[PDB]
Amino acid sequence: AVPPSLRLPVIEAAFPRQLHPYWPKLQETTRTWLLEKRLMPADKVEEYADGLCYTDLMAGYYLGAPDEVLQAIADYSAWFFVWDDRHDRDIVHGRAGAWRRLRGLLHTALDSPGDHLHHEDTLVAGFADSVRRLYAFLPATWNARFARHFHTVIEAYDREFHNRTRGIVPGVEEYLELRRLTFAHWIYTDLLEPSSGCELPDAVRKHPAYRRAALLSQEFAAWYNDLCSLPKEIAGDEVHNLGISLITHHSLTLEEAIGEVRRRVEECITEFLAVERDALRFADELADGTVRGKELSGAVRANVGNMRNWFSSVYWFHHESGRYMVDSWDDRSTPPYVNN
Ligand SMILES: CC[N+](CC)(CC)Cc1ccccc1
Ligand SMILES: [Mg+2]
Ligand SMILES: [Mg+2]
Ligand SMILES: [Mg+2]
How many other β-carbons are positioned within 10 Å of the β-carbon of residue 309? Predict the structure, then answer.
């Protein structure tokens, strides 16, 4: 029962959900990882971890991934949500120094995760553990691209810290650019490749159809999060949300801003369907009767398939996850799963 302001019939009719067979063990293993890495208090892990659906989200995304790859992705992604919470709490507590030091350690750990596996900040240690494992799947050229992308992501989170401390709501276009980094568009595009077992040549992953399909998948997901997380973000004095940029800088009502965000989300779907056809045509061309061409074509088909799976996984995640159920919280402004 999706609220009509949030319901997308095209997703419900034409993007059937998919689920990785490892998900039952994935849910248990990531929960244990959160406990053993002390990324959330044990009582909050017990009450909320499964209800947050972080493993469900990724198991509906990276279909076909080796179990060990999916486990590293799920641990990294659960860490990422907890990092978003830490970021938020440092902002509302005014802990500029604590955030600066964390930001610095993540940059260093990103380049040398082994050195940081037992850092006193368990949030740094958990990052290092998941990143070191992600670095063990593909050649070092893929590792360097992941690092390059995530250095940029950290600095976008730092820009958000300064915005919220200074009381700045970004403009629409500045927000749209920033959001491709705070949502980690290019990290989760990178992770398609270990999931299908193949570092893609630049001429393949930078093909205009591959690049556009990857972009639209993430824009849909980011803007649909904006639509669904707007209530809890308004309650929490978050300022980063396409709807908030529209209300602040364009005199839209709340109902009008929600309408504009929804129509932009909808356009992502139908733009994706067009480029998806082009990307699969490119896959057909790559299958030229050679083993390498069969390998590249198969990787493109899997990766573009998972770009499509991202639509349905993100859609249902926002209605199943306790992360967004602000009407059920004792304090709408302080979600019960965050460490305050
Ligand atoms: C890993 C989660 N993420 C990615 C940067 C930060 C919170 C946003 C996200 C929210 C909801 C669904 C998917 C991704
Ligand atoms: Mg957030
Ligand atoms: Mg955030
Ligand atoms: Mg959000």
Answer: 23
Torsional class of 253: left (φ above 0), alpha (ψ -120 to 50), beta (otherwise):
beta
Q: Residue 30 in contact with residue 160, Cβ under 8 Å?
A: no
Q: How far is the CA of 230 from the centre of ligand 4 (A)?
A: 7
Cβ atoms of residues 204 and 220 within 8 Å: no
DSSP letter assigned to residue 114: G
* Interatomic CA distance for residues 289 and 285, integer angstroms: 10
Query: What is d(CA 273, CA 109) in angstroms, rounded to the nearest whole number?
Result: 38
CA angle, residues 49, 53, 56, in degrees to nearest 5:
130
Active site residues: 80-81, 183, 323
- Which residue's CA is the nearest one to ligand 1's atom 5? 183
Q: How far apart are CA 15 and CA 272, in angstroms?
A: 12
Tell me the three-class secondary structure of 263-327, residue by residue: HHHHHHHHHHHHHHHHHHHHHHHHCCCCHHHHHHHHHHHHHHHHHHHHHHHHHHHHHHCHHHCHH
Q: What's the gap in Å between 33 CA and the centre of ligand 4? A: 24
Residue 294 CA, ligand 2 centroid: distance in Å = 40
Q: Which residue has the tokens 């990178």?
A: 190
Domain ranges of the chain: 1-340
Which CATH number describes the domain made up of 1-340?
1.10.600.10
Ligand 1 pocket, residues with Cβ under 6 angstroms:
77, 80-81, 84, 183-184, 221, 225, 314, 317
Residue owning the nearest CA to atom 6 of ligand 1: 81
Contact indicator for 220, 273 with CB cutoff of 8 Å: no
